[PDB]
Every structure is written in structure tokens, then in C-alpha cells.
Amino acid sequence: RRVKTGIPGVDEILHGGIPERNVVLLSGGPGTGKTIFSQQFLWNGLKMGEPGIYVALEEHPVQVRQNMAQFGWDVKPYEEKGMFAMVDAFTAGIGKEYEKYIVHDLTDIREFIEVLRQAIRDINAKRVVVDSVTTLYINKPAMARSIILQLKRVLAGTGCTSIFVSQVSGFGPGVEHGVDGIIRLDLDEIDGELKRSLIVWKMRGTSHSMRRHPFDITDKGIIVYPDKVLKR
Amino acid sequence: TRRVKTGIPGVDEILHGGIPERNVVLLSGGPGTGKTIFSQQFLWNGLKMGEPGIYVALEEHPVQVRQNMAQFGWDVKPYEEKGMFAMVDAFTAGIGEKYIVHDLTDIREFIEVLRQAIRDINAKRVVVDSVTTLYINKPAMARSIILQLKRVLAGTGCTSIFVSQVSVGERGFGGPGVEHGVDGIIRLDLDEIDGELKRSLIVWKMRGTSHSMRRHPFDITDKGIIVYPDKVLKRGKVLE
Amino acid sequence: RRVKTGIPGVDEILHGGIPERNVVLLSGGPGTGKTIFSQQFLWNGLKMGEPGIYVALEEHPVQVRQNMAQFGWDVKPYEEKGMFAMVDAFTAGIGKSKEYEKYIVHDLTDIREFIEVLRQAIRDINAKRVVVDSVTTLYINKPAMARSIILQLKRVLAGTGCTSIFVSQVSGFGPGVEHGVDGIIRLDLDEIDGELKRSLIVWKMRGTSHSMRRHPFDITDKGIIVYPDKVLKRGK
Amino acid sequence: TRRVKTGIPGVDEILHGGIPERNVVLLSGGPGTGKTIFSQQFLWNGLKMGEPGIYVALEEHPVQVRQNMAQFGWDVKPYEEKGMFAMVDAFTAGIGEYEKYIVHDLTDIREFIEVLRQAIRDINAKRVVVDSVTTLYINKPAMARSIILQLKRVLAGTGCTSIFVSQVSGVEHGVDGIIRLDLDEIDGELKRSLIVWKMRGTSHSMRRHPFDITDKGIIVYPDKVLKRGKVLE
Amino acid sequence: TRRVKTGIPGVDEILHGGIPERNVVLLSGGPGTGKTIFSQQFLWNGLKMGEPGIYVALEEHPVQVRQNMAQFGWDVKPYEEKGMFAMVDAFTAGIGKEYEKYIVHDLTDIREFIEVLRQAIRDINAKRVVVDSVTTLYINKPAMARSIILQLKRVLAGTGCTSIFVSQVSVGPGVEHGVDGIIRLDLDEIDGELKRSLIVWKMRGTSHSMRRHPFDITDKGIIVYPDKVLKRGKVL
Amino acid sequence: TRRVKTGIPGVDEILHGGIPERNVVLLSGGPGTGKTIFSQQFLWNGLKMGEPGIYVALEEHPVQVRQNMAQFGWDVKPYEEKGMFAMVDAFTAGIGKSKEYEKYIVHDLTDIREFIEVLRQAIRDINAKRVVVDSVTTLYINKPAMARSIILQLKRVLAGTGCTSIFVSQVSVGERGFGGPGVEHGVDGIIRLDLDEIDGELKRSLIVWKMRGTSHSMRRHPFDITDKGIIVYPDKVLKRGK
Numbered sequence A: 001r002r003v004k005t006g007i008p009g010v011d012e013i014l015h016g017g018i019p020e021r022n023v024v025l026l027s028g029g030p031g032t033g034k035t036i037f038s039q040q041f042l043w044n045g046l047k048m049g050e051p052g053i054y055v056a057l058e059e060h061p062v063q064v065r066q067n068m069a070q071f072g073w074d075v076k077p078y079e080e081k082g083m084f085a086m087v088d089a090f091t092a093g094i095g096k097e098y099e100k101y102i103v104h105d106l107t108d109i110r111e112f113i114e115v116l117r118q119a120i121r122d123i124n125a126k127r128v129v130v131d132s133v134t135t136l137y138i139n140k141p142a143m144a145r146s147i148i149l150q151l152k153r154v155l156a157g158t159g160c161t162s163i164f165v166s167q168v169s170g171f172g173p174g175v176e177h178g179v180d181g182i183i184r185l186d187l188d189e190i191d192g193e194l195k196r197s198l199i200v201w202k203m204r205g206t207s208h209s210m211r212r213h214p215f216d217i218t219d220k221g222i223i224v225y226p227d228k229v230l231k232r
Numbered sequence B: 001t002r003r004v005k006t007g008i009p010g011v012d013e014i015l016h017g018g019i020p021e022r023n024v025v026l027l028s029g030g031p032g033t034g035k036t037i038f039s040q041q042f043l044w045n046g047l048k049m050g051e052p053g054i055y056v057a058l059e060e061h062p063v064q065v066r067q068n069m070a071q072f073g074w075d076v077k078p079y080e081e082k083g084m085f086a087m088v089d090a091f092t093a094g095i096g097e098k099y100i101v102h103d104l105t106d107i108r109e110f111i112e113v114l115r116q117a118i119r120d121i122n123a124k125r126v127v128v129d130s131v132t133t134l135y136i137n138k139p140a141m142a143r144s145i146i147l148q149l150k151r152v153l154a155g156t157g158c159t160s161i162f163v164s165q166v167s168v169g170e171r172g173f174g175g176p177g178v179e180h181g182v183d184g185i186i187r188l189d190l191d192e193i194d195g196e197l198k199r200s201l202i203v204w205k206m207r208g209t210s211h212s213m214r215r216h217p218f219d220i221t222d223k224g225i226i227v228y229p230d231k232v233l234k235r236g237k238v239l240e
Numbered sequence C: 001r002r003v004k005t006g007i008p009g010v011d012e013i014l015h016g017g018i019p020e021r022n023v024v025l026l027s028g029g030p031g032t033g034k035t036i037f038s039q040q041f042l043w044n045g046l047k048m049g050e051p052g053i054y055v056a057l058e059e060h061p062v063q064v065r066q067n068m069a070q071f072g073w074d075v076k077p078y079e080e081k082g083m084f085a086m087v088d089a090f091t092a093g094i095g096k097s098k099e100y101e102k103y104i105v106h107d108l109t110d111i112r113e114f115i116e117v118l119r120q121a122i123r124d125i126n127a128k129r130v131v132v133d134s135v136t137t138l139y140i141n142k143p144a145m146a147r148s149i150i151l152q153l154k155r156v157l158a159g160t161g162c163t164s165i166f167v168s169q170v171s172g173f174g175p176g177v178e179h180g181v182d183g184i185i186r187l188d189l190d191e192i193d194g195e196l197k198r199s200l201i202v203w204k205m206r207g208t209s210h211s212m213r214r215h216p217f218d219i220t221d222k223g224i225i226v227y228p229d230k231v232l233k234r235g236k
Numbered sequence D: 001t002r003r004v005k006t007g008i009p010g011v012d013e014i015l016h017g018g019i020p021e022r023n024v025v026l027l028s029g030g031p032g033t034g035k036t037i038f039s040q041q042f043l044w045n046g047l048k049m050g051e052p053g054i055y056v057a058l059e060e061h062p063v064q065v066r067q068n069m070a071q072f073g074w075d076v077k078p079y080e081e082k083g084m085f086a087m088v089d090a091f092t093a094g095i096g097e098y099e100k101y102i103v104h105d106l107t108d109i110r111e112f113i114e115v116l117r118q119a120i121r122d123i124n125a126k127r128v129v130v131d132s133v134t135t136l137y138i139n140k141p142a143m144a145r146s147i148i149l150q151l152k153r154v155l156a157g158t159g160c161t162s163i164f165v166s167q168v169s170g171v172e173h174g175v176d177g178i179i180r181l182d183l184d185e186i187d188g189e190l191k192r193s194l195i196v197w198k199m200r201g202t203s204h205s206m207r208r209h210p211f212d213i214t215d216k217g218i219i220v221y222p223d224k225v226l227k228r229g230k231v232l233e
Numbered sequence E: 001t002r003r004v005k006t007g008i009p010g011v012d013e014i015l016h017g018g019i020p021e022r023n024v025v026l027l028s029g030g031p032g033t034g035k036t037i038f039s040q041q042f043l044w045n046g047l048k049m050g051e052p053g054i055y056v057a058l059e060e061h062p063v064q065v066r067q068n069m070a071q072f073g074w075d076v077k078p079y080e081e082k083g084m085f086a087m088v089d090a091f092t093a094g095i096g097k098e099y100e101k102y103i104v105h106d107l108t109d110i111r112e113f114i115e116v117l118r119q120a121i122r123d124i125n126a127k128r129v130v131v132d133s134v135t136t137l138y139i140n141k142p143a144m145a146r147s148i149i150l151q152l153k154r155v156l157a158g159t160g161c162t163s164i165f166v167s168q169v170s171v172g173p174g175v176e177h178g179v180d181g182i183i184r185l186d187l188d189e190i191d192g193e194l195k196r197s198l199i200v201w202k203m204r205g206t207s208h209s210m211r212r213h214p215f216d217i218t219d220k221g222i223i224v225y226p227d228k229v230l231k232r233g234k235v236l
Numbered sequence F: 001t002r003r004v005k006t007g008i009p010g011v012d013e014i015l016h017g018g019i020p021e022r023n024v025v026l027l028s029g030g031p032g033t034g035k036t037i038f039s040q041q042f043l044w045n046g047l048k049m050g051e052p053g054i055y056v057a058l059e060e061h062p063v064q065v066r067q068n069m070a071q072f073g074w075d076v077k078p079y080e081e082k083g084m085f086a087m088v089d090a091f092t093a094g095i096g097k098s099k100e101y102e103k104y105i106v107h108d109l110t111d112i113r114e115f116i117e118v119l120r121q122a123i124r125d126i127n128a129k130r131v132v133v134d135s136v137t138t139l140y141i142n143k144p145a146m147a148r149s150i151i152l153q154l155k156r157v158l159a160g161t162g163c164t165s166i167f168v169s170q171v172s173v174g175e176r177g178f179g180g181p182g183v184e185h186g187v188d189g190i191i192r193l194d195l196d197e198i199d200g201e202l203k204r205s206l207i208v209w210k211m212r213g214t215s216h217s218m219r220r221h222p223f224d225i226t227d228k229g230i231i232v233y234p235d236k237v238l239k240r241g242k
Ligand SMILES: Nc1ncnc2c1ncn2[C@@H]1O[C@H](COP(=O)(O)OP(=O)(O)O)[C@@H](O)[C@H]1O
Pocket: A028, A029, A030, A031, A032, A033, A034, A035, A036, A037, A217, A218, A219, B180, B204, B205, B206, B207, B208, B209, B210, B211
């Protein structure tokens, strides 16, 4: 089977959607849409009755809710329903309001994984987003490989299908070799104008579009154009 | 979302209304691209609108900053006496004033002092010139430094600009995590095209709003910066 | 003698196939089809009476079996008849040890045990074909050791009459590794005019002449298909 | 805002009047781009204008510097004995007779600064050259920023306008101005060009202008531009 | 000046007679560019001309080198038994841990390496020597490359030998300056096609072709074409 | 300023008279570009104009070096005897502590102190007016931070004794620059010897990037290496495409 991202054009680009248990790496530079994209993935997940967990390391949950809320995505209700979770692995990297979930020390991936399996259990999560995974090893690159594979085993085991968001200043040291899929979002200046484009570089378990497709970010999120191709 | 008007000709148009309230905007660019003049113009316009502002100086002493702003027609003195503007001296300490940061070993005193200045004048706009100096010899501390300041500023209702210094040639914005941690990124460029340096601005990122995706030329004048939303740079200036 | 990969087009491109006992480095970036190519190589071998061994360092043998099954390649039958074997050199890398697997390398910090289990596996099934996916994981965090490791494994495998494929992960071909192996086959995925095109090229192959051209190929439901009579210069 | 005339042919026009008083200007370029001749002509024209100048030597011994200048027709001797010109020796302490101003330890700029303050005070200097400031931190780049900022404050606070020579093979953000001298090979020929990247306090030509080094120093052509690899206009 | 004929078709002509005797020639190139074959051809042809030769192996065990040379019709067995050819084993020591007349037990430094080499040159009155590859002697200690190349050079030239130092380059200090000559072998992809070329970058003691010449590797070794040149494709 | 004539065909013209006295000229380029040959032709011509030269050898033994210059029709034997020419052995110490015969020998290259000691002594016994250090790169290649002081220290020495010199600088093939931060700003002159593949052919060319004290050709001139030495063509220009 597959997992329908719900993101206009994407499921057609993946020929049906993301294969189950697959951990997809969404990489790209700043402002390419990785945040809106992965949030949309989870949001659409909810509308289809699929449990979702957002592991934030870049922003605090109260902030994430506000960002999504501005696109017309109110997770608060589902949060009360027990169909959506927000894991705070953010306040730990900046200092010290509680939450159902929180990682106090990311020195090790141990507590990180402990708290993760909890949120998955409580809502029987199906969809998961780690934004971002880069923060777990940016200053400890040799440990990236083990970290990516370990989180992978855990998620796939619980039947979850994942987007790891990778921040790029390549796709990210075994990281791009460890994941099942790779979707790169690009923002390129062409003839004096910035053009957004998406391309599925890798996707274990399926055939997929081999073309670079433009896309726009709108008030209601991302919209990819499967019938169009952008030439850089 | 509510917008903060920069007042800089062309910029609020380019931002489809202005900077979304509480956004931290990274103003990135090489030397002599107009980043300092731009950030000060942003603060001055705020004052004219009744929005108290703070300029955290890490590149020059506040005394010189006041002098330089005055030459553009921006005398902050009348405002400092009204408790509507403030200069934080985070410069002196770098090379051995109501607001002073004595030690930049840790970001702790920097924050305490910034918080002090914020409540003192009911600040709405803040400028840090420049953020790079806070970790340029501490690259690994950049991420947490940017994320901690951002939290303090948005948490106190401020809308800010973080000036980011990049060395000429590099199209970077500031490095790992920093360009990822800010809410917006406005790049000011100075490119040599056919034996001529041309200035241009481009909004690479701005959370909470759509914005022009084109590279617009601009000039630095006696009255500050002026961006031209109706012109684009495609290896040469052209209308629309 | 030639070891036939059985992968459509490959053997013609190798003018017969891989010279026996050769260690071939299969290099490429992520998603270029290296795992599938090497597994297809083992599969075809089983189909022609040649025992094979897949040494996993990137995935657990269980998932590998699954993955190969989706392509129509069920090894389970051969595994019980002593014709195929998976070597778990993965778990040690993550941490878990909560399962039973015949061949398993507990510690990857030394190539000593790795070679022990490999020798035992080759002994047990009389291995003729061996795949290591990926050798890169064995020295990524020890590049100065890569040279010895490649030549060491090279001596073992070749000594036991095995012909092997070492999968190399590229983010060149890998310092001194590209020199240690007998052959080099590069799998590429390049964006040309807004579209990703898959291609293969034989850079090196001690023991034989071979196509000096870049050939397009496709990954399908039944695996890889390479086109010997087609060439991808650049664009078409 | 007052202007300091470099007196170098074409340069003041390009700077739209001259260097804004008290500005520290970084003169950056690779070897043999003309940075030393330029900075020395700057001081010379200054002297021949009643403006006392100091040349801080970190690359050659003052004795040799005096020799290089005289060869172009700039004899500082008369001006030096008259207390209108001064040479600072911060060269010897870097590798191994008599010189009025000498910096014994370059470990850190404190002594460097003191000797510099003395020379300025002593001749009431108006122009100062540091050839080259790169040498003060070539092995300690993390110190470059503070050093540049410290010297800038000392010089500006004393009313001097300076040129820091930067040898290329937060510094550029710290100085007030930046003039790049280039030497590029185009069609089998080496062409010299100058370009003002930045100059706080004023507007200036935004073009790359060609120049020649002659027996009498540098001549820049403000009415010419170097575009592809050709001199146009 | 006295010349040493390589015997490789086209080479001696490109060298205007051949290698100036007593010269050390660095044969540099990436993987699969034909450096081993070229070097071995040089020695084989040397034997056929009554010029004893030595091959210092650091990449493969002398056993395998013998069998690979035979693969091209170069059976050194007849000459060795007659004290005309020698195989130095400076390989096994490289991967830790068989009798070989000439073996180097410690590569930690090159004193022993020089001893063994000195012994072999004397025993056979060697006139041609090949070291494959000299890169392995300092790959992990770049700073020592210069002195090692200069030391080996003084010893070889001191014994009247003419040599070829094979240098392994991946993809792209003292070394190239320390040798007498430099012959680069390349393998480049142009328009979906891999093309082999040789160019004499330096050869002390003589003039030589200043052009890049294409060449082929066959079942009988290398063949260089002095009448062809690579502007970018093969032209006249 | 009196010019030291190189004698090398076409060079003194390109330099508009020759090399300004006391100038330390860095001659750099990749392997096989003709730097050693160029430096020797310089000392040789220095002899014929009745000018005493020294050749500091760090890449070859003085015996081999002599055996190399002779191969070009340059026999310095008669001059070493009249004391009009000297050769320094700074090669052996680089690859061992072995003994041998040579009037001038530098035993330790850890520091440049002895080097100068021996050099000043060598300049004295004869009438050292021309000097060649080949290659200066060897002095600091493993300790790049020392390059600057080493270069300037040797400069002062030679200039202080009225010597005009060439420092041979070895750069790797493909490397653009001349020896890095230190070397290139500290020398008075820089002459680049290039060997570039243009249209399937290697072409030799020279270009003067810097020469304090004089004007000079600003163009790239082709040249040939012959059995008699180097021949640079001042009236020809090579166009590399860069
Ligand atoms: N309403 C909107 N209309 C069009 N574009 C928008 C709108 N809101 C936000 N954006 C775009 O979304 C971008 C940010 O996307 P995001 O996923 O947060 O970036 P990143 O890849 O750094 O995580 C902004 O830079 C902006 O260009």
C-alpha cells in the first residue's frame, strides 16, 4: 500500500504515495518549504483519520501550532482527541510550561527514542515528522549514520511512515544512504526570479516521476505540478 | 498577519505588506552592501511611527552610530530623551552608556541587558549589528545563540533584524543553522557586472507571507536606501 | 572463466561477464540502484547453481529478504538448502542484539571477526558469489584503514574462489580503494533537461576488455535492465 | 564632511572628491598589484600638501622603503628631518642599525599602538599607512577583527586618515573603505584595474577602472572601464 | 645519451629514442588507466632484450603478479630461474602477516625496503626496475614522500638501474619534482565514451613529444599511437 | 639601477634591461617547466660576464648538478677552481646524515641558521654576485608558517651582500599561485614558467608577474628548452584562453 500525502501533485509523483514504513528524507536549503510541506503531510494525515506526531527541534510546540494554524490547520482539537502529538526536543537545546512529551537531553539518542515510542503508543501514530533530524548530529557528524538508522528501525517497527527534514547549507554522511526515500525541494534564481521545484531522487519500494517539477507555496500550503517540468 | 512597516521605499511592497510581526529577519550580505544603513532606516521609520526601537551595536561604539545616523537625517537624541530609543553597547567589550554588555563570553549578560532595554522603552523594533560577531569564532554556538535571542525577542513582542556579515564572493547567508533559525532572510548584494557594481535586494525567505520572488535593484542615497519594486535585475536593469 | 551476472545487458558489456575471483566495486550515490543490481547478481547466480552470500551492513537480513521478495526473488528456499546465506553485519552497528541469525558479526570495530563469519559462511554453502553492501560502512569512520580492509577481504574471497561485488556509497569511487579492487562499475543518476537519467559505465575490469561506453538502464519491477546497444553521451 | 586628496591621478575623482577624513581604507590585492607604490604615493602627495605622514613598515626595513620611494622621485629625507614624515619599524621584530620608531614585540598590538601614538603625536600626522596590516595577524586570524577595530579607533581618535595594505594570495567589514587593486591576464596580457568596493561617507564610481604604474607612480583612468577583458570608453 | 627501450609500440618514438638511462619515471594515473600493464610490459620487453628486471609489488602478492603477466603472454618463470628477473614482495607486510626469495617484512620505514631492493639488484645485475606502487610507501605519511622518492632514486641510479615508479592518483608536493620523468596515463569520458591517453609531461635528458596521444590496451599489452593526438577527441 | 643581465635569450629584453640589482626573484611553476635549467643558465651567463655565482642545491647533489649543467655545454669545473663559482650542498641533509666530500655543506635544515651561516661563508670565499636557491620550497614545505620569515631572512642576507638571486619555487601541476602566503609577497620579483595543454599540445610560456624596481613586459611569451638552454621570444605572445 501507500500513504497519501494529500499534497496536490505529490502522490501522483510518487505513483500513489509513500510506501509504508518508509522514512523519507526531505532535504533543501532555508526557505524551500520543507516545514510547510511536512506539516501539510501530517495535517492531511489527520483529515484522513491517520494519527500524526510532529517532533520539533527547531521551534517550540506553541510556535508550531501557530504556524500551522495560519494555514488553516488547527491541531488543537485533534490533540485533545488523542490523534496528534507534538514532541518538544527543542527547549532542550536552548535552555529550559510543560508538554505531554519532552526530551530533556539530546546528548544521547536514548531519551529521544524513549519519548518517541510513548507518543506513538498514546495515539497509535501512523505518520511522523522529525523537524529537524540534522539538529541531532550537526556537531557530531560521525554519529549521524547510527542515529538515522536507529530512528528508522523504531519508526518502521511501529508501522510509521516518516519525513526526516534535512537542513542543507548534497542531501545531508550515510544519512542520504540510510533513508528509504529522498525528496529535494529547491529554490533557484533563474533569469532574476526565484523558482521553486521538487524532485524525487530516491524512493525505496516504488517507481516514481524522474522529472523536476515546479511548485508554489500558497495560503493553503504547497501545490506541485506533475504535468510540468522546470529546467534549471 | 499584522505587518511591521519598514518604511524603506519599495521594501514593504516587496514584502506584500511588511515584516510579519515578531519575525526575526536575517539581513545578509558582504561588505559595503548597505546592511547597516538599511537596519537603521528600519529603526528610524519605526520611531516616526511611535514604535520604540533598539540598536545593539557590536561593530561601532554607540557614539559613532548616533553620529552616522544623524548624517542621514536620523537624529535619535530627541527620542532617547523620551525613552523611545536605546543603544546597547556590546562593542566596547569586543576590544577592551546606559546599556552596556561587559562580557560576551556567554550570551547570558547580552540577554539580561537586551531584556532590560526592551521593557525600559517598551521596544517594538530591535536591530543587532551584527549577530555574526557573537559567534564568528564560535561557529558551533551560532544555532543556540540565534534561537535563544529569537525566543527572547518574539516573546517580548519585538520584530527584529539580525545583520549577518558574510565575506565577499560567498553566496552564503551566514552558515549552518543560522539561515535555518531565522524567520526571514533578505539578501543585499553588490555584484560586478560588465565592469560595474550593481546593488540588488532579494527576499529569500519570509515566514508568514508571500513576497516578491524577483531580484530588485536599489540605490543608497543621502536619505537612505530606496528599492525599486517595479524593476528587476537580469544581468541588467529592466522594467517590470 | 566468466561469472555471468545474468542482468540484461551487463554480461555483453563485460564481454562475457565478470572474470572469476574478481572483486568488483559497484559505486554510486544514493538511489542509483546498487543494492538491486547486486541482489539481482546473487539471484541469477542461485538460478544457475552458484551459491551466494549477501553481507548486510545497511539493513537487517530480515528486511533484505523482504525487499528481494518484492522483486520476485525469494531466497528462503535456497537458504534452507544451503545455497544462500545472509550475514548480519548490521545490528552491531545500531545496538540491538535481540534476535537469532545464523551468521552475525557482533563487533565491526575489527575486520578480524568479520572475516571469520565470512569464511564460515563461504565454507558452509561453498559460496561462489559474494556481495558486501556496503564495504564503505567498514571504514567510513576509518579511511586510513580502507586500503588494508579492501585487500584483506580481497585475499579471503579470491582465495576461496569467490567472485564479489563491493557496494561503495558515494555522497570519484571511494583513499586507495578504487585502486585495490579488480574492477569498477559506476551507477549514475544525472539530471538532464529536467529529468533524471540512469546510466552505467565500466571504468575498470582487470582480466578482460569491456564496453568503453556509458549505457542507459532502467530499474523495473523485475529488477535492472541495461541497454548495450544504447549510449548516453549527454542528453540523449 | 572633509576630504583627503590622495593626489593620485584619477583616484580622487573616483572617490567623488577624495577619502572622507578619518576613514581607514583597506587597499587589498595580490602581489605586485601596486599596493605599496599606491600607499606611498598617498603619503607623498600628502607631504607635498602640508600633511605629515607616517609609514608603518612591516614588510621591508624603513631604510629600503626610503630607497623605493626615492626611486619614484619621492625623497622623504627633507621631510623626515623637518619632522613632517616618520617611518615606523615593525619589520625587524618579525624576522630577526638605528631607527627612531621601532616595535620590538609583535606578539600583540599594545606596543605597536604605543609606538604609533608616539609617531603621530610627534609629527601631528594626518596620514598613516600600515604595510601591511595582514602581517599583524597572519598566524592569528581570530585576532584580525579586534586588531583592525583597535587600530581604526586609535587612528580616527587622533584625526588621521589611513590606508591599511592587505596582502591576498570581519576585517573587510571593520574598515571604512575598500579599494581593490587587481592584475588579470586577458588574451596573453596582464591588465591592471582598480575598483572601490566600499567607502563609508560618500558616493563613488561603481566601475572597474584600468591603471598604469609608471616611473612617477600610479595613474588611474576614471573615464575608462575594464569590462570583458577590454578597455572601453 | 644511452636510451632504455620500453618496447611498447609508439612509446620509444614519443620519447625520441626511449628513456634516458638511469632515469626514474613516475607513471601517474587514476584507477584502471593501464599503469600496471604498462610497467610490466616495460620489464617484459626488457628481458627479451637481455636486460634483467625487478618488479617490487606492494599492491598484489608476487604470486598473482606472475599469473597476470602470463595472462598477457609474459611468463617470467623462465627468466627468474636464470637469475634475470626478480619479484620483490613488499605487499604481504602491508596487510599484516609463504617463502619468497625477496621479501620486505617491515614497511614502517624504507631502510629494509632499500636493503632487499639492493640485494635483488645485485643478484640479477638488474637494469630495469618497477615499483608498484610507490604511493603505498607514504600514502598515510605525505610528509615523508619527498625523502623516500629521493632516496630510492639515489639508490637505483647509483646501481645503474632505470626505473618506473607507479603513482596512484584518485581523481585530479616534492614527488613530481623529485623524479626525472613523468608519464601520465589518463582515462577520460567524452560524449558517453571512455578514451585512454598518454602524455609525457617531463623527461629529463631529452626532448619528447609534447602532445597527448591516445592508446589502447589489448590482449598483448599497450599500443600507443604517435600519429594521433587528443585535442579533445581522437584527431590526426 | 644597474641591471643584472641574465643572458638568457629574450629575457633581459622582457625585463627592460634585466634584473634590478639585489632583487630576489621567485621563479615558480609546476614540474617540467624548466626552472632548474633557467636558474643554471643564469649562473652560467653570470660567469661569462665575469660574475661569480652560487648554486644552493636542495633537490640534487652538487655532483649530479654539475653532471647536469655539463650536459648543456656548461662546465663549471674551471670556475670552481678559480673561485669564481661555488656550489652548496643542502641536499644530503634532507635525506640522511651521510658523509661525503663538498667544500660547502649544510648539515642541519631544521633551522635556517646554519644555512645562512654556510651561505654567507660561501658568498665570502668567492665574489658571489649571483645566487640560486633550488628549491627554496624544500626549506619550509612541511612548516608553511615559517616560509615568510625564512624568505625575508634569506632576502636580507643576499641583498646585504650585493647579490642578485633566484629562488626556485615548486608548485604542484595545476596549482595557480606561486608558493602561497608568505613567499609571493616577500620576494621582489616573480617570474612564472608555465607548461599548459592547449589543443592537445603542451606549450611552454613565461610571464613576469612582478618585478620591483622596473617596468617590464606584461605579456605571456612562448619559449623553448634546447640542448643549449632556454630561448624566450619577446616578439611572440601565447594566448592560453585565460
Ligand atoms: N501565504 C503565503 N503565500 C506564498 N508563500 C508563502 C506564504 N506563506 C509562507 N510562504 C513561503 O513559505 C516560505 C517558508 O517555508 P518553510 O517551509 O518554512 O521554509 P523551510 O524550508 O526553511 O522550512 C517563506 O519563505 C515564504 O516564501
